[PDB]
């Protein structure tokens, strides 16, 4: 089972090679290869993700933005190289004039910086931090496409930071702290000395001015910002730091976030976001000039950063590491309500309890699926539910639950990777809904500390069970 | 003053003909004409909008989805005509194979329906309703582009409904009820007999089979669904109904939502969303077959619907009708905190009060701008603030406010189009923040009834004041 299997079973995506009813052709022969089609289970995940990440960034001091999907290629000529990158771009004509589907958000985020400087000049505070849940499209050959990992259109938790020399170490460190908060609180992935690695990729000093563009001073101030920040990370968490000479991009050094995972029992890297300096963009968009003239700052850095990286890719690898098991806030089905029918007259109270709880949870904004089951059917029904839909919480309502006034509620524990039984007392349907909503709020708590609000995007997914 | 002026002054957009610092070229010569670039003030509006509309639709029974931005042209060949619509499409090549930037979400939403039928068959409930905050791109000639009204890339509150004959009148009516809830609660625009018109566009019966495709039966069942629904609308609200013979699309009849507005004092239509039947798509994607075979339903309808329509266009016309005055939830600056300094020692308590209130409002997730003003500067500072930034709420903190322990708080009243003064007592900074947050929650209340949650996407926009 790969993420292609989990994504399909959880209905996060449509499988490219599933056959379209009546056409008996594959979904991929309508959509094209490497264009992930998010389905009904995946839709609420995408809105929840944008909203949580946007709000998380706004609370940490980033301006949230949305930039156009297309642009004149003048935009990418200025940025540019163009002769090279042109080749990874989807290009088209309006009206003699060359346009591209955006492959990166950077030039747009810089124009937004430039517009604010023109309007407000030095009243604009530095560091200037801009975040976008951004949608980018890039050429990939057919043989390179794989699931959600390598695709033609995808999403980044992208941000750009323009930070003076006096604050750059803190900014680098803070981005690490942001990455950790998102992993731990949104995804429930522990970030510690045993699970995490920070890798720095630096210049070869003998090659500055040639394969590494820019000045010695730029490279030294940037590499030294990464070393101090990484030294604070290691001091604080005992997280180990790896430095690779000569591995930086031509336009600046970087730091990569790397989770260490184990099979099976093989130790494997899971690469996530990056912090990437850029000596090219401040030259091409005249940012060094603009900052010097308007702010009187001579030492300034331009940073590209993501925490997750590609969201599709992140999600792909997540589905594998966690065997289809989503955190409560991101689970296609949040509460599965399972009515264990008996054949006897108690089935009426069971049916009314299940149905009322389901309605009440939907009204609180939760994603709910009701399953009609039976004493003899239960074991096989549950097994299907676990091997396919993997609801965040199972609520079992049988004769015993009705007579004893205690729900049998099974939350899936992401650390132990097991269901955990809770006994939830209730007086009636409404009281049961309140109590189930309390369990949910506890599961939502870490996401509230990131974004202020946990997203409630309700859906009735009963048809899936 | 047009929406181009308001959008720029509120920093909702970058002005195409603003000059880029140092390049002294126009922003439009990097972006291309008719590609709206949303700026820092516009970013939170876009995320808030997606989130509110998505959640509103999920609570009303729509599945929320996000579909790809690109597609093989096979997708649009099936839908199709293609020979015609090809001409409004941005087309590009991967790897010998023709792709398009999506001009409409419809075919993707139908594939998602088709995938769920293949997986779950008749367990999928009807009506099937799917909503998307969707991003579409269409060819427009340079001479056709105007502000936010007619552009090359834009957003729709798009949905598709597959509804059996037994439920179609109710679905039509409900979409009207959805449109009214969004206008009134999100936008504070009254929908009544005096402000609103419903226009139906129908076949010419003599032309069915020729300029109007499909069968008599289809057209009659659809036109009659619109007449009954419209008759319920008129019965309930006294809203008047206009019917135009021969004005339908070739593929089905429709209803348009039309607000009536007055200048100046000229009566003008403001066209919003549409409810559009389609006899083409169920043939091209074999939906009539699929529904008949899997659900045993012979009478079924396919509907395209939006409430606002183009969101950019809606927003453009809104900014004009309301002279730059956004509802609280959507205002770039939610609280402007204005410190009226005196020159004397009370300035310290004023500065600490303003600063603490600002911080406290930011921590609640609000969009805040602090302005340092003075007794003699106030009148001109306020005038600049009103003519430019138009904050949802002004909080004036001077010597009097500090000594009397009562804030001077001015909410902008969208109906009367005037500031309205409130006297907000406080004991200290924290208590003031709580009380200001209470005023905000009252202003957020209508948006909570739509979406469960009002969006808090914080920002410090002090630099704008
Ligand atoms: Zn970048
Ligand atoms: Zn449509």
From Swiss-Prot, chains A, B:
Major place of residence: cytoplasm
Keyword hit for Lipid metabolism: no
Localization (cell): Cytoplasm
Stored Pfam families: HGTP_anticodon, tRNA-synt_2b
Enzymatic class: ligase
An example molecular function term from Gene Ontology annotations: threonine-tRNA ligase activity
Textual note on the cofactor: Binds 1 zinc ion per subunit.
One GO cellular component term: cytoplasm
Annotated stretches, region: Catalytic: 2-327
Cofactor annotation: Zn(2+)
InterPro entries per record: aa-tRNA-synt_IIb, aa-tRNA-synth_II, aa-tRNA-synth_II/BPL/LPL, Anticodon-bd, Anticodon-bd_dom_sf, Thr-tRNA-ligase_IIa, ThrRS_core
Keyword Oxidoreductase found: no
Subunit: Homodimer. Probably interacts with its editing subunit.
Protein name, per record: Threonine--tRNA ligase catalytic subunit
Source organism (scientific name): Aeropyrum pernix (strain ATCC 700893 / DSM 11879 / JCM 9820 / NBRC 100138 / K1)
Organismal lineage: Archaea, Thermoproteota, Thermoprotei, Desulfurococcales, Desulfurococcaceae
Gene behind this protein: thrS-cat
